[PDB]
Each structure stands twice: as structure tokens, then as C-alpha cells.
Amino acid sequence: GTMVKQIESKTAFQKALKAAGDKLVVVDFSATWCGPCKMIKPFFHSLSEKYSNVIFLEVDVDDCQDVASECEVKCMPTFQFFKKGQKVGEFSGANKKKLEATINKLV
Numbered sequence: 001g002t003m004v005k006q007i008e009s010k011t012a013f014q015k016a017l018k019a020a021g022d023k024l025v026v027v028d029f030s031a032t033w034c035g036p037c038k039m040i041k042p043f044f045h046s047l048s049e050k051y052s053n054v055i056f057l058e059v060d061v062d063d064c065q066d067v068a069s070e071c072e073v074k075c076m077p078t079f080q081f082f083k084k085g086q087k088v089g090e091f092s093g094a095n096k097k098k099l100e101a102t103i104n105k106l107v
């Protein structure tokens with residue numbers, strides 16, 4: 001029963017960032033064909049349940065080529081972290097340890 005919101009456009013992305021209010025937002029920039037993305041996706045979804053006070057968004061880079069370019073995603077999965085629409089952290093790679101440590105550092 002995932003809390004992850006699928007983002008399908010640049011407009012949906014901006015509005016999700018604003019809807020977060022003051023809460024940490026974590027965004028997974030992913031693709032359907034990407035092996036490491038597929039490996040970490042269920043863990044990103046489980047974390048969305050573990051951390052009910054953090055907002056979890058998924059952006060498919062083939063769906064949201066505009067979001068991917070603007071957010072300067074070079075490889076997938078990339079995880080970017082926001083507060084009030086503002087980027088407060090980022091890293092690249094399907095790294096479960098780093099993903100959870102970054103949530104805990106930033107929340």
C-alpha cells in the first residue's frame with residue numbers, strides 16, 4: 001500500500017513540491033528499463049510507508065523528459081531531496097543505505 005506519488009508532468013511536479021508544505025520530499029528519478037531502478041523501487045516504496053512524515057515522489061524520466069533535464073538527472077536512479085520546493089540534497093545510484101541515511105539526515 002505505497003504512499004509514493006507518480007509524477008507525470010512538470011506541472012504535477014511543481015504542484016507536488018508545493019503540496020508538501022514544510023515536509024521533506026524525496027524524488028526517485030527512474031526508468032522502466034533500468035536494472036538498478038527496478039532493484040531499488042520496492043525499497044523506495046517500503047520507505048514511503050516507514051517514513052509517513054516524508055513525501056515520496058517517483059518521476060519516470062521517459063515520461064517527464066522536461067523534469068529530468070531541468071533537474072539535471074544524468075543517470076538513474078537519482079534521488080533528490082527538497083524542503084519547500086528547495087533542493088537540500090542529492091545523490092546518484094541504487095544505494096539503499098545512502099537513501100535511508102539521507103532521509104534521516106534531512107528530515
Ligand SMILES: *SCCS(=O)(=O)O
Pocket residue numbers: 014070071072
Ligand atoms: S529539480 C528542478 C525542477 S524545476 O526548478 O525546473 O521546477
